[PDB]
Design a protein around this motif. Structure first.
Motif, PDB file in Angstrom:
ATOM      1  N   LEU A 192       0.826  -1.203   0.000  1.00 37.57           N
ATOM      2  CA  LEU A 192       0.000   0.000   0.000  1.00 37.57           C
ATOM      3  C   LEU A 192       0.863   1.257   0.000  1.00 37.57           C
ATOM      4  CD1 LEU A 192      -3.130   0.490   0.090  1.00 37.57           C
ATOM      5  CD2 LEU A 192      -2.352  -1.881   0.284  1.00 37.57           C
ATOM      6  N   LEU A 243       1.024   4.131  -2.852  1.00 33.89           N
ATOM      7  CA  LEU A 243       0.883   5.543  -2.517  1.00 33.89           C
ATOM      8  C   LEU A 243       2.024   6.363  -3.111  1.00 33.89           C
ATOM      9  CD1 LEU A 243      -0.291   6.948   0.851  1.00 33.89           C
ATOM     10  CD2 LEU A 243       1.950   7.617   0.082  1.00 33.89           C
ATOM     11  N   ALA A 290       5.387  16.017   0.473  1.00 31.10           N
ATOM     12  CA  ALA A 290       4.789  15.489   1.694  1.00 31.10           C
ATOM     13  C   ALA A 290       4.425  14.016   1.542  1.00 31.10           C
ATOM     14  CB  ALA A 290       3.563  16.310   2.070  1.00 31.10           C
ATOM     15  N   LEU A 291       3.981  13.618   0.349  1.00 25.59           N
ATOM     16  CA  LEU A 291       3.730  12.205   0.097  1.00 25.59           C
ATOM     17  C   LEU A 291       5.024  11.402   0.212  1.00 25.59           C
ATOM     18  CD1 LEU A 291       0.913  10.756  -1.067  1.00 25.59           C
ATOM     19  CD2 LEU A 291       0.948  13.180  -0.537  1.00 25.59           C
ATOM     20  N   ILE A 341       7.510  12.205   2.213  1.00 24.24           N
ATOM     21  CA  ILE A 341       7.786  12.100   3.648  1.00 24.24           C
ATOM     22  C   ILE A 341       6.952  10.994   4.282  1.00 24.24           C
ATOM     23  CG2 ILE A 341       8.403  13.493   5.643  1.00 24.24           C
ATOM     24  CD1 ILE A 341       7.606  15.971   4.143  1.00 24.24           C
ATOM     25  N   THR A 342       5.656  10.934   3.965  1.00 23.69           N
ATOM     26  CA  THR A 342       4.841   9.918   4.626  1.00 23.69           C
ATOM     27  C   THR A 342       5.275   8.519   4.210  1.00 23.69           C
ATOM     28  OG1 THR A 342       2.621   8.987   4.858  1.00 23.69           O
ATOM     29  CG2 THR A 342       3.031  10.299   2.925  1.00 23.69           C
ATOM     30  N   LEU A 360       8.503   7.773   6.331  1.00 21.35           N
ATOM     31  CA  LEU A 360       8.273   7.522   7.750  1.00 21.35           C
ATOM     32  C   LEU A 360       7.505   6.224   7.977  1.00 21.35           C
ATOM     33  CD1 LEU A 360       7.434  11.224   8.675  1.00 21.35           C
ATOM     34  CD2 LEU A 360       9.642  10.111   8.353  1.00 21.35           C
ATOM     35  N   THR A 361       6.510   5.924   7.137  1.00 19.25           N
ATOM     36  CA  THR A 361       5.839   4.634   7.262  1.00 19.25           C
ATOM     37  C   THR A 361       6.829   3.490   7.087  1.00 19.25           C
ATOM     38  OG1 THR A 361       5.193   4.896   4.946  1.00 19.25           O
ATOM     39  CG2 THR A 361       3.549   5.421   6.627  1.00 19.25           C
ATOM     40  N   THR A 412      10.108   3.469   7.589  1.00 15.95           N
ATOM     41  CA  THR A 412      11.081   3.325   8.669  1.00 15.95           C
ATOM     42  C   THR A 412      10.427   2.790   9.940  1.00 15.95           C
ATOM     43  OG1 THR A 412      12.672   4.469  10.084  1.00 15.95           O
ATOM     44  CG2 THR A 412      10.852   5.750   9.253  1.00 15.95           C
ATOM     45  N   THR A 413       9.173   3.170  10.216  1.00 15.95           N
ATOM     46  CA  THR A 413       8.482   2.557  11.351  1.00 15.95           C
ATOM     47  C   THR A 413       8.282   1.061  11.139  1.00 15.95           C
ATOM     48  OG1 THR A 413       6.205   2.916  10.583  1.00 15.95           O
ATOM     49  CG2 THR A 413       7.302   4.749  11.758  1.00 15.95           C
ATOM     50  N   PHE A 464      13.285   5.618  -0.901  1.00 16.96           N
ATOM     51  CA  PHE A 464      14.370   6.585  -1.030  1.00 16.96           C
ATOM     52  C   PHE A 464      14.585   6.977  -2.486  1.00 16.96           C
ATOM     53  CE2 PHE A 464      18.398   5.158  -2.897  1.00 16.96           C
ATOM     54  CZ  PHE A 464      19.097   6.344  -2.966  1.00 16.96           C
TER      55      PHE A 464
END
Ligand SMILES: *[C@@H]1O[C@H](CO)[C@@H](O)[C@H](O)[C@H]1NC(C)=O
Ligand SMILES: *[C@@H]1O[C@H](CO)[C@@H](O)[C@H](O)[C@H]1NC(C)=O
Ligand SMILES: *[C@@H]1O[C@H](CO)[C@@H](O)[C@H](O)[C@H]1NC(C)=O
Ligand SMILES: *[C@@H]1O[C@H](CO)[C@@H](O)[C@H](O)[C@H]1NC(C)=O
Ligand SMILES: *[C@@H]1O[C@H](CO)[C@@H](O)[C@H](O)[C@H]1NC(C)=O
Lengths: 337, 342, 341, 340, 344
Positions: free
Chosen positions: C226, C230, C247-248, C250-251, C254-255, C257-258, C288
């Motif tokens: 998913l 995105l 911003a997309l 960035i999200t 972060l998703t 890396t979590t 990346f």
């Protein structure tokens, strides 16, 4: 005569003494005077709903066949061998609300057995029981738990064995302080149950009820101040210049997210219970207040996109929100002590 | 008449009674009418598929070579310490992960002997039994947890177990479970499982457990709904302040995915899917769709009657989202509260 | 004639039978045929590198001194309390962190003497056997955990262990594992290990355990799919909507890396790379790469001079190369780990 | 000739052998040659500073009262149950937070008596020994955990412990550890500690352990380098947008701090500064310097040819930071891999 | 002359000695001199308030019934198994959550009997003693943990405990603790507590532990200083980049409240306020006051024009005041908690 001679005469495998017979067989039931000394109290865990207590259980009864022979004199109480403590007759005793217990035996068995001239025998032993007390959390940060001890005989019907508390000071504790609680030394309710199981007669049971009052200092300095500061930060956001979105939006969203994370972190540790408590009610009320600030800003922005009307609404909300927060705080604290 | 002499003549050394041989050896199998009284119940965790109980297990059986006539009293109570000199039926729990007696100030047991030879033997236990857990609809599941009694040292030809005719399994008054609620009705069955060494007797009692979801409501469903509605409010403000709205979108998505991670990590590992997982996944999909729609609006807004189209699509989705969320919520609730179970 | 008289004459005080002396002493080694019935199986924890089992261990051997003739019946169950006055073969599990008996209302032991002299001895145990794990392909690995039975106090010249010809190890019907499957086929081999003090008999049984990927698939692979879809949609947006694309990105970052933090913290520390780690590292690399391509496009668009056309062309080329690259990586990974590995 | 008669005549009641008194009483001290076979190893938890083992401890001694000649066989094995009536030398492990025997279907013991009187006594134990640990250089540490076999109930005037001549401690074939490599070489030393109650014998063995670098490297060392590479690429931007650049700076900080906090929390407490802490701190300093460079570029972007100076400072940073990280990386690796 | 027969004549079946009657029965109370050797120390957990030791507890007492003259040797190191056949003085630790013996290849005991009858009984124990632990100043606290040896089955009229005159407590060489250090001086006191059943003897030894603050400093104080410095640097920017100022203030508040919440996770829930709580709360309030000042000055700027000046002057005053106030608070707190309140 040596102490061995009298000790064997009063009880011995050779002498006519049978440990498998209670005193006054086929007669009046033997009453046991139970006395408890609490050496250490605490380690009460909310998640498992149990606490650990180190108690010096003391019980005495009447043993006619244990009467000290007239040859011995000069001592009102004669100490005997803790090893031979197993030889004498014992009143069967167990704790009804007991998860587990662990006898203490370091460098020797931890049991003391006095024998008096008239036949009374006092048995004191060191115990480490882990009692479970179902605790209510309707008002969690401030509450008075009632954790209870239920001593009870098992192997003997109430027609044979009976438990009676000591007349003077039957529970003694020596200045013990729980990490987060305050046990009331004076307010220790007593009473006995004599629980009755179907098809097995009546079993006597004495009872102790402790009134533990939870200290609220840690939770007041832990969550209440950060939550108040977050709502004050939201009000500061309100005081920031309106019709300038960039500053406003992050403040409100971050307030809401911080409050939600605080609620999750502070509710994860507590035991999972069906009913609602005070901490989550307070957290959800603060979260709804932050949400209200966010939707108020959204209303201001949609009204802007007339400026006096938007400014008037913003000023009215910025004056009203401290007032309603104060009213909610007053009513909540008054209701929940 | 002397009680010590009577005890010696009943089952003592001079009695001649042998505790190494079952009653009526080489004959009909000795029957045991066992019943169990529950004292404590709790610590039932699905993480390791187990639960713990405190039972007052009582067994009754006949013993012809143990009846007495010297004492007129019938229900003669004797001390637990003498119980090692009288034959006892072998018994153990099949679905047991670990158990121990209770030894506090004495040995926790009780023995009574009747005139006709019947013997009552109640010995305290603390069982950390295990039952498989079915988590098809985890937050609102109904789970059946079982305990099993069976003998090991004797075949059906020598020892037969059975329940009690009246009130086989009881519950202490005012028993409260920490998370579930115990349904009053309890099932009784005969497992009588067979091995390759013989046909060992077995007795099973089923407990029907139902979970209260209110805690799961408060701790898991309300926060997700609040976060989603926050994304809704994020959508409500127009697209003029693109960076603020998009940053709020990122942060709401991050918090929602960390909530999902915590929700799935709080529970053990199972191959299939559970109700909480479906709810969290759908709500995450909703917030993702909201972010995608905002990105589409920004794409249309960035370079005609294009701002009119952007506003029209914004209003259209602002009206479309309530119907979708309401219909999904009502459908999920009705299916998992009535249709899926009961 | 009394049964107590018979029991005393057989193995009692007046029997003369000495339980401290091996049967057939100073002769051929005793012959023990053992079969094990598994009752419960689970708690397979790879953090501690072991698992818990619950078995009905059964052993049979021959004692010429236990032959009896008073009772014509052959199969004669006896009280388990006599199990301490009869010779019992030594048997300890070589690989077990901790094991214990089970006592409830009695001792869980069964003893039986036949007329010829054969003895049965079934005992219940719970063993925390330890099996080293190979996690080269962690989500879809095949684990073989070993239970080793062997003696301690007797040399091979004295005690010999061996499986049973039929039904050597039998699994209880309806047994289920929380996160594993048991294959019907099981392997039986003789370890017969050699120590410095002599040769000791040994018996080894292997279980072939495979891990179903359902939970791990749902928990890890689908969210990453998913996220990358995105990122794809983020790619499809033109560079003029720079804040949205950034911003997309960035999200996505972060998703990913979590998810990586969760995956790497969910497992014990192991030096070599596992399949889930390689897969999630490639997912992070793809995210990346999306960030890098967006940054390059923004840089090109910065300092219209026919640069917009080239930027659009390269954006389209990269947004058409991303699906081919991701699809080829996914198919390659799946085929290699499902067939070749 | 009957084995029961022989057992009774050697250790039995009619033997007269008193297992309650050491051999050669009021004489020369009996000497014990003990060798230990390691079966299982692992679970070296750094949080509580201990490790657990499964050893097949074996002991020997010369007991003159057990000599026999009736049985022609020499290595006459005996049932383990006889050990309750045989003089067992005292032996306990000085450093162990807890140890237990093993019983399954029997007691895991082995007894063997030779003709000349020598006795072999083997027993299986599980021990959670404790070894203090040094974390001056955590991921690349070479550790030395210790085991001390020593007597407690006998002065060195009575009982003497000593290792075997050859193959004192042998590890089982195929032995492995979750995260360490147990090198072949093992050191044997005479411990022989002193107490105020007398002179007590003490036997010591040392195990050399080193930590494998694969897991920690693959888990964090590569990702931090890649994050810094991303920052280096971000030094080639011309300040496209302010909040987006701020977010791009903050993201690297977040990845950096998550990795550093996880690695710091994975370890117990040591007062001195370690390798991984130094690496994380320098990464923190470098990413913070990247943020400061972003702030400086934003500052000089605003109002002289300040644009040329801004571009020059940007390219100076882009040419300086990679070389600084390269030199720091090579320096840190060489010092904490060879020179420390 | 047979050593086994000598042991039997001393305490065996033919001896006639009984292990249940204390020496000097119906006479003076027998005195016991005990000393403790420490082998291990650590696992001091503040959450449960207990620490684990590993001690070679030794006891000595006189017994005329165990006086022998046949053997010329003064000291007879006897087998540890005899200890069940002789009288042993009861001795339990008053404060301990759980204790157990050590049994590996044998029971860890020893028996050494002198000619005159002196008996030197030692044993190996592992005690999880519990010592109450205050944290008024959590990172700079000096803790006193105690061990209370006392008899249980005997009144002081029968059994009397007392420390050895010389070398009462010995510590094994090279003992180190993960987070503390044991000072050389150890106090010895007589608790001799009273109960309702008599006047029981008691013996207490005090341990003084001072805590090293390296980890707390490095892992918690430095991040707070960096955070407040970053807050000052962010505030130094002008009002043109107002959204950047707000975002930096918000992220500072978020990271610092995360630090404060995570600070209290490893320590028991204590009603009183500790040093870490004071420091975190004060610095977080400093950041919040900086945000409040920024909001007030922005309100000033929200309608050059006799307002931009004012705002700049107030910002400069805050820039000249906040670092000085923080430094004076820091020095005051550090000196008071280092000298005036506790330690040093
Ligand atoms: C215990 O309860 C019983 C109930 O029958 C009562 O007779 C008895 O007096 C009670 N004992 C005490 C000590 O109050
Ligand atoms: C015990 O119950 C069983 C089952 O009903 C019955 O067959 C048997 O006759 C009963 N009594 C005896 C003494 O075996
Ligand atoms: C068991 O195995 C041995 C070795 O093969 C064989 O000689 C012997 O006959 C078998 N049976 C018995 C009862 O010893
Ligand atoms: C045992 O070893 C010690 C130490 O070398 C030695 O003095 C002694 O003679 C040896 N033999 C005997 C029988 O004690
Ligand atoms: C032991 O010490 C006590 C206390 O000082 C003293 O009264 C007594 O005489 C001493 N000796 C004996 C043998 O009890």
């Amino acid at each position: 005569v040596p102490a061995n001679s009298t000790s064997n005469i009063l009880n011995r495998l050779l002498v006519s003494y049978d440990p498998r017979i209670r005193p006054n067989f086929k007669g009046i039931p033997v009453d046991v005077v139970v006395n408890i000394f609490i050496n250490s109290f605490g380690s009460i865990q909310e998640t498992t709903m149990d606490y650990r207590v180190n108690i010096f259980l003391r019980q005495k009864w009447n043993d006619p066949r244990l009467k000290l022979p007239s040859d011995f004199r000069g001592s009102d109480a004669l100490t005997v061998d803790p090893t031979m403590y197993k030889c004498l007759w014992k009143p069967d005793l167990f704790f009804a609300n007991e998860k587990s217990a662990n006898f203490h035996d370091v460098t020797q068995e931890n049991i003391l057995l006095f024998i008096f001239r008239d036949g009374d025998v006092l048995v004191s032993m060191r115990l480490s029981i882990t009692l479970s007390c179902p605790l209510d959390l309707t008002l969690f940060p401030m509450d008075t738990q009632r954790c209870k001890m239920q001593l009870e005989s098992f192997g003997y019907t109430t027609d044979d064995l009976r438990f009676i508390w000591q007349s003077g000071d039957p529970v003694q504790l020596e200045k013990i302080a729980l990490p987060q609680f305050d046990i009331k030394k004076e307010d220790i309710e007593y009473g006995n149950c004599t629980k009755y199981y179907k098809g097995t007669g009546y079993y006597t049971c004495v009872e102790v009820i402790f009134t533990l009052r939870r200290q609220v200092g840690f939770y007041m300095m832990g969550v209440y101040a950060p939550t108040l500061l977050i709502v004050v930060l939201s009000w500061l956001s309100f005081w920031i210049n309106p019709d300038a979105s960039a500053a406003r939006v992050p403040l409100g969203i971050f307030s809401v997210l911080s409050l939600a994370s605080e609620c999750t972190t502070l509710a994860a540790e507590l035991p999972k219970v069906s009913y609602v408590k005070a901490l989550d009610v307070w957290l959800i009320a603060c979260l709804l207040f932050g949400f209200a600030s966010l939707v108020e800003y959204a209303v201001v922005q949609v009204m802007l996109n007339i400026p006096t009307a938007a400014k008037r609404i913003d000023l009215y909300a910025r004056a009203l929100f401290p007032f309603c927060f104060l009213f909610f705080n007053v009513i909540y604290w008054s209701i929940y002590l | 008449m002397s009680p010590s002499d009577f005890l010696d003549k009943l089952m003592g050394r001079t009695s001649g009674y042998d505790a190494r041989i079952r009653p009526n050896f080489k004959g009909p199998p000795v029957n045991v009418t066992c019943n169990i009284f529950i004292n404590s119940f709790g610590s039932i965790a699905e993480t390791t598929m187990d639960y713990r109980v405190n039972i007052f297990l009582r067994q009754k059986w006949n013993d012809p070579r143990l009846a007495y006539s010297e004492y007129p009293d019938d229900s003669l109570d004797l001390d637990p310490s003498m119980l090692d000199s009288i034959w006892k039926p072998d018994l153990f729990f099949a679905n047991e992960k670990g158990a121990n007696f209770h030894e506090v100030t004495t040995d926790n047991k009780l023995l009574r002997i009747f005139k006709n030879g019947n013997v009552l033997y109640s010995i305290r236990l603390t069982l950390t039994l295990s039952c498989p857990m079915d988590l098809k609809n985890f937050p609102m599941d109904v789970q059946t947890c079982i305990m099993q009694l069976e003998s090991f040292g004797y075949t059906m030809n020598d020892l037969i177990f059975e329940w009690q005719d009246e009130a086989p399994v009881q519950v202490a008054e005012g028993l409260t479970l920490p998370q579930f609620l115990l349904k009053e009705e309890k099932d009784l069955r005969y497992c009588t499982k067979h091995y390759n060494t013989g046909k060992f007797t077995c007795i099973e009692v089923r407990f029907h457990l139902e979970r209260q979801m209110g805690y799961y409501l408060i701790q898991m469903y309300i926060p997700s709904l609040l976060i989603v509605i926050l994304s809704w409010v994020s959508f409500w403000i127009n697209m003029d302040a693109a960076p603020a709205r998009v940053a709020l979108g990122i942060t709401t998505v991050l918090t929602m995915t960390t909530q999902s991670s915590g929700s799935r990590a709080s529970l053990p590992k199972v191959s299939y899917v559970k109700a909480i997982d479906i709810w969290m996944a759908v709500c995450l999909l909703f917030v993702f769709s909201a972010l995608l729609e905002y990105a589409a609006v920004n794409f249309v807004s960035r370079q005609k009657v294009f701002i009119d189209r952007a506003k029209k699509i914004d209003t259209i989705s602002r009206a479309c989202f309530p119907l979708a969320f309401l219909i999904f919520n009502i459908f999920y609730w009705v299916i998992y509260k009535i249709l899926r179970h009961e």
